[PDB]
């Protein structure tokens, strides 16, 4: 029960193949069925398949919707489960979760945090980060809203924080948007004591090991 952890790449080009892996902590791996469920952003989960008990012989069933392309396997010796995907297509872009089946409380009594798999022939490109400070003769109250433009990056996601979490007051990080094959996103924060304090946004893009600290 305690923990289910998925790992496995994210950006892959069409036609390729990929292997996600799921690890299970805190329970006898071998005594449970294990599942893979995926969910395309903005839509309901979709059940992929499962691998049986040790008792049922570790056999597998698959949702016909994918069957043929996906295979599931375990490594009972070290509590790992795997999902092998082949001929990745564009619609296979989604968050993939492994989920223990369970006894009584089932199916899916425990999920993992998921991992996004992005299928596309675009390339890993880091973001450009611009500070957003109130401009050209603009009045402003005692609490000023400031922001950061995170532009032209791929693929998702990026991470924005303020004053390294120290100022997590009024913070709004807006969902990304696809402008001609690249993601652009915006983040706002609020500060009384605007100028004399120092506000910095911390952006990070893992798909490029980018970590930027833009001061405003």
């Amino acid at each position: 029960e305690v923990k289910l952890l998925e790992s496995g790449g994210g950006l892959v080009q069409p036609g390729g193949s990929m292997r996600l892996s799921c690890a299970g902590s805190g329970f006898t791996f071998t005594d449970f069925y294990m599942n893979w469920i995926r969910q395309p952003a903005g839509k309901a989960p979709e059940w992929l398949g499962f691998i049986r008990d040790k008792a049922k012989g570790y056999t597998t069933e698959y949702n016909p919707s994918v069957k043929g392309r996906f295979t599931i396997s375990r490594d009972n010796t070290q509590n790992m489960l795997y999902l092998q995907m082949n001929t990745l297509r564009a619609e296979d872009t989604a968050t993939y979760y492994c989920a223990r089946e369970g006894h009584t409380a089932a199916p899916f009594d425990y999920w993992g945090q998921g991992v996004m798999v992005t299928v596309s022939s675009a390339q890993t490109t880091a973001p450009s980060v611009y500070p957003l400070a109130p401009g050209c003769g603009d009045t402003t109250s005692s609490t000023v809203t400031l922001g950061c433009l995170v532009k032209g990056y791929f693929p998702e996601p990026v991470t924005v924080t303020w004053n390294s979490g120290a100022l997590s007051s009024d913070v709004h990080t807006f969902p990304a948007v696809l402008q001609s094959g690249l993601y652009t996103l915006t983040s706002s924060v609020t500060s009384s004591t605007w100028p004399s304090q120092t506000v910095t946004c911390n952006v990070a893009h893992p798909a490029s090991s980018t970590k930027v600290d833009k001061k405003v």
Binding site: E46, Y130, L149, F174
Partner: protein, 214 residues
């Protein structure tokens, strides 16, 4: 395959109210129907299994019922930590199929937005690009419209984005972007963000700035 339908898709209720979620299977599923709660940025979590069994650790305000082709999830009194999307799951037969889902929105008192406009950064410019930004924050209800206008003229090469209901004040925030080339950004002067909150106010809200400056 067994196709699951849920209704309604969206649901706004006041904290403390009675809420009811519907799920219809297209074949008798007998008693095998589950409910999952998925909060923002989280993996679905099991609420109830086989039309009416609460799972360990879930509050008593939840209950399920119905049987065969129609099922219901009912929340006696809506808590703010119950704002989320809800999924129905048929599992008598493989492939196991989920329902379309239902999103709950906590209701609140109208709120006019705080609008804010940002001219391009000297840095973005120094690279011949220019994005004007308009943060349109903490408003309610969700319906709203923003328009950009360069020198009084409505414009379009825009990009909008709205957050999800905030867990702290139940408002919505929106960000709109206006991307131009440095050259075109320079052959104009007054940039504007006008928002109309079908509610809050009639005279509409406008924020601008003169590129040469006031």
């Amino acid at each position: 395959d067994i196709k699951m339908t849920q209704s309604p898709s969206f649901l706004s209720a006041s904290v403390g109210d009675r809420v009811t979620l519907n799920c219809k299977a297209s074949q008798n599923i007998d008693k095998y129907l589950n409910w999952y709660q998925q909060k923002l940025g989280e993996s679905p979590k099991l609420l109830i299994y086989n039309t009416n069994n609460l799972q360990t650790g879930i509050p008593s305000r939840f209950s399920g019922s119905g049987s065969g082709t129609d099922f219901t999830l009912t929340i006696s009194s809506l808590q703010p930590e119950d704002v989320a999307t809800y999924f129905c799951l048929q599992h008598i037969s493989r492939p196991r199929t989920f329902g379309t889902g239902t999103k709950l929105e906590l209701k609140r008192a109208n709120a006019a937005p705080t609008v804010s406009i940002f001219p391009p950064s000297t840095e973005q410019l120094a690279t011949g690009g220019a994005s004007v930004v308009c943060l349109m924050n903490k408003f309610y209800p969700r319906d709203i419209s923003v328009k950009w206008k360069i020198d009084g003229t409505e414009r379009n090469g825009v990009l909008n984005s709205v957050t999800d209901q905030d867990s702290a004040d139940s408002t919505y925030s929106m960000s709109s972007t206006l991307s131009l080339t440095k050259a075109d950004y320079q052959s104009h002067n007054l940039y504007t963000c006008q928002v109309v909150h079908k509610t809050s106010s009639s005279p509409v809200v406008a924020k601008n700035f003169n590129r040469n400056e006031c």
